[PDB]
Amino acid sequence: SSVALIVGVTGIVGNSLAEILPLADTPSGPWKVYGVARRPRPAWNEDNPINYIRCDISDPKDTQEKLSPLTDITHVFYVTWANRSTEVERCEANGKMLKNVLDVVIPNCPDLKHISLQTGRKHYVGPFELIGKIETHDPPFTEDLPRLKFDNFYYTQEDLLFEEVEKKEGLTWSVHRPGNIFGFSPYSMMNLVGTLCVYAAICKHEGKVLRFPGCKAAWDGYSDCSDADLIAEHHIWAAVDPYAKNEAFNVSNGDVFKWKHFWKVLAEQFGVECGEYEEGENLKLQDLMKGKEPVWEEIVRENGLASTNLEDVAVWWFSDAVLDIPCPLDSMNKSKEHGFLGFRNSKNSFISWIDKAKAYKIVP
Ligand SMILES: NC(=O)c1ccc[n+]([C@@H]2O[C@H](COP(=O)([O-])OP(=O)(O)OC[C@H]3O[C@@H](n4cnc5c(N)ncnc54)[C@H](OP(=O)(O)O)[C@@H]3O)[C@@H](O)[C@H]2O)c1
Ligand SMILES: C/C(C=O)=C\CC/C(C)=C/C=O
Ligand SMILES: [Ca+2]
Ligand code: NA
């Protein structure tokens, strides 16, 4: 029987894994599912038939307590991280988090088959504070080129993963590298779609034009993205397909787009006048949206929305870090050569995730 541990179940990918793993048509099903996060279970995560567990995986004592009784786990899906002010601090905090989970699950789960680790495109472009400032390999990024000669918590987690799986014979791993994720999660630390929806809603409320808060290269250069459900399918495929074992894979939608085109779609979905890129202007959402909490409360009250905190539902720093840089492309050749043919139309994915935020009454 298949039993999953989703580590970060209320996250942008964890929440897709919570909806997909229990479905009857899912490979290796029927799946029993345990979902871990620190907060109490939110209302928008309830619609999934998972066993929700409150646990802080940065706490070794808490991890030992909550996870040691889950002896029936066969597959681990690790979809979480902790942000710190520098990459060296991110290596320490994220290495400990992964090690705390693995040190407990491996000796306590005799039927444990696979550990799926989510990382990302920063494997190739570098940590947040070095992006655009270092020499990278040339795009499209392929999986097995050498690591950058700078600290990166993904390299720490991979090396920890490789040495952890040695403790159990027949234990396999996979690494999943998405770019910017289009998904649903009002609790995610990095939710571009959710943040853009809140921005569009505020513009509609204040009768302002939907100004583009990014650079020229993000506006009219090519971009790509990774649909959250597609990433969830990619985790599952690697977890059950023996030809996918012990490999790192990119996971992006299979097409490209331009923010210039998606700007129309976003404006049309919230009934706002479509603004554009302005050759001046250096617009930042972190600055534009400072002190909009009362305006968000007006929007919440007037449209019968779920009660959310502006700071949870709109991570302004992340939307600015995304739109103020070029989006170098990655390659899906390794995934496709291994039998994974999943893909998404990125524009349809974008509309689908906007509509999910609306359907859960997060935005108007
Ligand atoms: N989101 C993106 O656009 C994006 C793009 C590329 C790569 N990635 C990478 O994907 C990986 C996973 O991130 P994600 O974006 O999927 O995460 P996310 O959407 O921010 O979700 C994190 C999840 O883990 C939980 N969590 C956080 N800290 C925890 C802790 N100490 N103990 C237990 N649970 C904890 C969260 O709930 P609580 O806070 O309630 O605990 C939530 O359920 C990271 O390496 C990230 O860099 C993300
Ligand atoms: C390249 C791009 C947008 O244009 C967005 C990605 C920004 C990054 C790599 C943020 C960290 O996950
Ligand atoms: Ca990344
Ligand atoms: Na989709």
UniProtKB/TrEMBL annotation:
<dbReference type="GO" id="GO:0016628">
    <property type="term" value="F:oxidoreductase activity, acting on the CH-CH group of donors, NAD or NADP as acceptor"/>
</dbReference>
<feature type="binding site">
    <location>
        <position position="122"/>
    </location>
    <ligand>
        <name>progesterone</name>
    </ligand>
</feature>
<feature type="binding site">
    <location>
        <position position="56"/>
    </location>
    <ligand>
        <name>NAD(+)</name>
    </ligand>
</feature>
<feature type="binding site">
    <location>
        <position position="189"/>
    </location>
    <ligand>
        <name>NADP(+)</name>
    </ligand>
</feature>
<feature type="binding site">
    <location>
        <position position="11"/>
    </location>
    <ligand>
        <name>NADP(+)</name>
    </ligand>
</feature>
<feature type="binding site">
    <location>
        <position position="118"/>
    </location>
    <ligand>
        <name>NAD(+)</name>
    </ligand>
</feature>
<feature type="binding site">
    <location>
        <position position="12"/>
    </location>
    <ligand>
        <name>NADP(+)</name>
    </ligand>
</feature>
<feature type="binding site">
    <location>
        <position position="57"/>
    </location>
    <ligand>
        <name>NAD(+)</name>
    </ligand>
</feature>
<keyword id="KW-0521">NADP</keyword>
<dbReference type="GO" id="GO:0000166">
    <property type="term" value="F:nucleotide binding"/>
</dbReference>
<keyword id="KW-0547">Nucleotide-binding</keyword>
<feature type="binding site">
    <location>
        <position position="10"/>
    </location>
    <ligand>
        <name>NADP(+)</name>
    </ligand>
</feature>
<protein>
    <submittedName>
        <fullName>Progesterone 5-beta-reductase</fullName>
        <ecNumber>1.1.1.145</ecNumber>
    </submittedName>
</protein>
<feature type="binding site">
    <location>
        <position position="188"/>
    </location>
    <ligand>
        <name>NADP(+)</name>
    </ligand>
</feature>
<feature type="binding site">
    <location>
        <position position="38"/>
    </location>
    <ligand>
        <name>NADP(+)</name>
    </ligand>
</feature>
<feature type="binding site">
    <location>
        <position position="8"/>
    </location>
    <ligand>
        <name>NADP(+)</name>
    </ligand>
</feature>
<feature type="binding site">
    <location>
        <position position="10"/>
    </location>
    <ligand>
        <name>NAD(+)</name>
    </ligand>
</feature>
<feature type="binding site">
    <location>
        <position position="188"/>
    </location>
    <ligand>
        <name>NAD(+)</name>
    </ligand>
</feature>
<feature type="binding site">
    <location>
        <position position="56"/>
    </location>
    <ligand>
        <name>NADP(+)</name>
    </ligand>
</feature>
<dbReference type="Pfam" id="PF22917">
    <property type="entry name" value="PRISE"/>
</dbReference>
<feature type="binding site">
    <location>
        <position position="154"/>
    </location>
    <ligand>
        <name>NAD(+)</name>
    </ligand>
</feature>
<feature type="domain" description="PRISE-like Rossmann-fold">
    <location>
        <begin position="63"/>
        <end position="364"/>
    </location>
</feature>
<dbReference type="InterPro" id="IPR036291">
    <property type="entry name" value="NAD(P)-bd_dom_sf"/>
</dbReference>
<feature type="binding site">
    <location>
        <position position="189"/>
    </location>
    <ligand>
        <name>NAD(+)</name>
    </ligand>
</feature>
<feature type="binding site">
    <location>
        <position position="190"/>
    </location>
    <ligand>
        <name>NADP(+)</name>
    </ligand>
</feature>
<feature type="binding site">
    <location>
        <position position="80"/>
    </location>
    <ligand>
        <name>NADP(+)</name>
    </ligand>
</feature>
<keyword id="KW-0560">Oxidoreductase</keyword>
<dbReference type="GO" id="GO:0003854">
    <property type="term" value="F:3-beta-hydroxy-Delta5-steroid dehydrogenase (NAD+) activity"/>
</dbReference>
<feature type="binding site">
    <location>
        <position position="80"/>
    </location>
    <ligand>
        <name>NAD(+)</name>
    </ligand>
</feature>
<feature type="binding site">
    <location>
        <position position="118"/>
    </location>
    <ligand>
        <name>NADP(+)</name>
    </ligand>
</feature>
<feature type="binding site">
    <location>
        <position position="181"/>
    </location>
    <ligand>
        <name>NADP(+)</name>
    </ligand>
</feature>
<feature type="binding site">
    <location>
        <position position="39"/>
    </location>
    <ligand>
        <name>NADP(+)</name>
    </ligand>
</feature>
<feature type="binding site">
    <location>
        <position position="12"/>
    </location>
    <ligand>
        <name>NAD(+)</name>
    </ligand>
</feature>
<dbReference type="GO" id="GO:0006720">
    <property type="term" value="P:isoprenoid metabolic process"/>
</dbReference>
<dbReference type="InterPro" id="IPR055222">
    <property type="entry name" value="PRISE-like_Rossmann-fold"/>
</dbReference>
<feature type="binding site">
    <location>
        <position position="190"/>
    </location>
    <ligand>
        <name>NAD(+)</name>
    </ligand>
</feature>
<feature type="binding site">
    <location>
        <position position="181"/>
    </location>
    <ligand>
        <name>NAD(+)</name>
    </ligand>
</feature>
<feature type="binding site">
    <location>
        <position position="57"/>
    </location>
    <ligand>
        <name>NADP(+)</name>
    </ligand>
</feature>
